[PDB]
């Protein structure tokens, strides 16, 4: 229905620090003909599941230093690549990627594998979609590890989650420029600029899925979805506040990447207040937007808090 393409498998031969075996589902409901990739790691029978959600413009490769810490703890880690990202398939047209289209895919993935005992792990778009999951089926979520993210709300009801779109000009205005404007978007240069600590090898891992620009339509639509929020996304995200503030009784863990210009403190302190029971965040001073690149430290501490309150 949705014309889509798939990335040559050879694009991933040389990945650094990605020894994970691939799994695929290609029959989600609503998602015909489309194949999705996801990591399934650790004891595939563990009580606890860490569902790890990626954001713009990355993939599961992102969680790569986190995954094993979670597996070695005795958890099963799921870690899906969205349609248009990593190893999943990619619709060719930006008109096909919407907020529901990626959200429904999430709910579909969750039903299908039947996950329970979830410790939701979000950042970026992964949190924007991922934080609307719980109210869908509350009985299946038990914890949350939230890194630099928030809810796509409409200006009035939460100004902090709209404000960063316009100011600073070297924050979200700059991120969106680097993404939707180049005719020749090199995600290795982009990442090396938004994450100065990456090595040339890592950076190249984030361009692997995209050989040419026709593979990038979903890379392209995401910043624009931050900018232009449709009604469903507003209603849904508005409905999520209420759930995190009044319904949620789960355990949480927050880590802030203080060097972030898009979603640092301005956005994280206000989120910390709407999550019923969210404790004193963990401020990572040398980290940017991609907190997961100071990942092990997060994964470790997140599990250390997790047990000290069980």
């Amino acid at each position: 229905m949705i014309n889509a393409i798939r990335t040559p498998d050879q694009r991933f031969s040389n990945l650094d620090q990605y020894p994970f075996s691939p799994n695929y589902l290609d029959d989600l409901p609503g998602y015909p003909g489309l194949r999705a990739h996801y990591l399934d790691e650790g004891n595939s029978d563990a009580e606890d599941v860490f569902l790890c959600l990626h954001g713009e413009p990355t993939w599961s490769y992102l969680y790569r230093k986190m995954i094993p810490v979670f597996a070695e703890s005795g958890a099963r880690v799921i870690a899906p690549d969205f349609f248009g990202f990593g190893k999943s398939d990619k619709p060719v047209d930006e008109e096909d990627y919407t907020f529901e289209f990626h959200r429904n895919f999430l709910l579909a993935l969750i039903e299908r594998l039947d996950l329970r005992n979830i410790t939701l792990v979000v950042q970026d778009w992964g949190g924007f979609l991922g934080l609307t999951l719980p109210m869908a089926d509350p009985s299946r979520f038990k914890r949350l590890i939230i890194m630099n993210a928030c809810l796509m709300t409409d200006p009035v009801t939460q100004p902090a989650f709209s404000a960063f779109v316009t100011q600073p000009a070297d924050g979200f205005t700059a991120w969106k420029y680097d993404l939707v404007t180049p005719s020749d978007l090199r995600l290795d240069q982009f990442m090396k600029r938004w994450a100065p600590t990456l090595t040339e090898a890592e950076a190249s891992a984030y361009a692997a899925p995209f050989p040419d620009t026709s593979y990038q339509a979903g890379v392209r639509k995401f910043p624009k979805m931050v900018a232009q929020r449709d009604q469903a996304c507003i209603d849904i995200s508005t409905e999520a506040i209420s759930f995190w503030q009044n319904d949620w009784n789960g355990q949480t863990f927050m880590a802030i990447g203080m060097k972030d210009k898009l979603l640092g403190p301005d956005v994280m302190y206000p989120m910390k207040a709407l999550i019923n029971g969210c404790p004193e965040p963990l401020e990572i001073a040398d980290a940017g937007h991609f907190v997961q690149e100071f990942g092990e430290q997060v994964a470790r501490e997140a599990l250390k808090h997790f047990a000290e309150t069980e």
Side-chain angles (χ1 to χ4, degrees):
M1 284 76 226
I2 295 354
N3 168 27
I5 40 158
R6 175 173 309 150
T7 307
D9 255 280
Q10 166 95 50
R11 281 287 302 182
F12 319 86
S13 258
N14 195 262
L15 282 350
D16 184 72
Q17 333 221 201
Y18 197 73
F20 319 112
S21 309
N23 320 70
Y24 298 115
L25 294 172
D26 57 47
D27 32 65
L28 298 195
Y31 310 87
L34 314 160
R35 180 195 85 176
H37 164 268
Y38 71 93
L39 290 178
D40 199 341
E41 279 286 307
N43 175 14
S44 103
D45 269 316
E47 176 149 32
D48 284 322
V49 191
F50 285 84
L51 175 45
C52 294
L53 307 189
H54 82 81
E56 166 76 333
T58 42
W59 55 306
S60 49
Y61 184 90
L62 184 72
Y63 281 115
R64 93 194 169 300
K65 302 169 158 171
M66 258 174 138
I67 270 165
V69 183
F70 295 157
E72 277 317 274
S73 108
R76 168 193 198 188
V77 174
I78 293 320
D81 286 356
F82 281 112
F83 285 132
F85 300 83
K87 12 173 169 173
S88 332
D89 279 352
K90 293 153 165 126
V92 303
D93 293 326
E94 334 188 355
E95 303 273 70
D96 295 329
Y97 306 76
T98 62
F99 176 81
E100 278 168 314
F101 166 98
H102 274 316
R103 179 196 192 231
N104 279 170
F105 150 76
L106 275 185
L107 290 182
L109 178 91
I110 286 182
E111 293 167 50
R112 181 95 152 54
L113 302 190
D114 187 67
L115 316 150
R116 312 192 130 262
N117 0 269
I118 311 159
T119 295
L120 199 52
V121 186
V122 294
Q123 175 281 183
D124 203 280
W125 266 101
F128 297 171
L129 285 151
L131 299 149
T132 53
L133 284 194
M135 72 200 182
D137 208 321
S139 39
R140 310 191 176 250
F141 295 86
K142 134 163 165 221
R143 311 186 307 214
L144 167 73
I145 285 174
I146 172 170
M147 274 149 323
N148 281 28
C150 47
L151 280 144
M152 293 303 83
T153 224
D154 68 81
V156 175
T157 114
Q158 292 290 333
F161 312 157
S162 264
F164 67 85
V165 184
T166 54
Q167 276 189 26
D170 70 343
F172 182 84
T173 297
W175 163 286
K176 197 176 168 270
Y177 166 93
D178 282 2
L179 299 157
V180 319
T181 88
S183 78
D184 177 49
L185 181 54
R186 318 232 171 175
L187 296 179
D188 53 327
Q189 297 181 23
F190 175 97
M191 288 291 317
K192 243 190 315 179
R193 159 187 288 185
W194 303 79
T197 36
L198 292 188
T199 58
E200 202 170 6
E202 293 177 309
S204 70
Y206 294 94
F210 332 85
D212 77 41
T213 73
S214 56
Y215 284 87
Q216 286 162 337
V219 170
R220 290 187 325 250
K221 172 77 149 274
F222 249 169
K224 306 196 196 154
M225 290 194 340
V226 183
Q228 318 144 38
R229 308 172 195 191
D230 54 27
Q231 215 62 37
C233 157
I234 286 133
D235 288 349
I236 286 160
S237 313
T238 302
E239 196 129 21
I241 291 154
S242 205
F243 168 92
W244 289 113
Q245 194 203 329
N246 315 297
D247 308 323
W248 174 251
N249 301 92
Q251 283 215 263
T252 316
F253 179 91
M254 179 207 273
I256 315 176
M258 290 338 253
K259 283 190 185 165
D260 183 30
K261 298 142 149 180
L262 299 65
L263 324 171
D266 291 79
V267 173
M268 296 303 272
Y269 274 106
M271 202 51 230
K272 186 263 189 213
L274 305 177
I275 293 171
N276 179 23
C278 191
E280 249 198 68
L282 170 91
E283 264 164 9
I284 286 138
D286 295 339
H289 189 47
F290 300 111
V291 195
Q292 310 88 139
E293 299 280 351
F294 291 73
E296 157 163 354
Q297 155 187 191
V298 185
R300 290 217 182 278
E301 317 274 350
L303 282 162
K304 144 175 328 172
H305 178 237
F306 272 172
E308 333 174 314
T309 295
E310 293 210 1

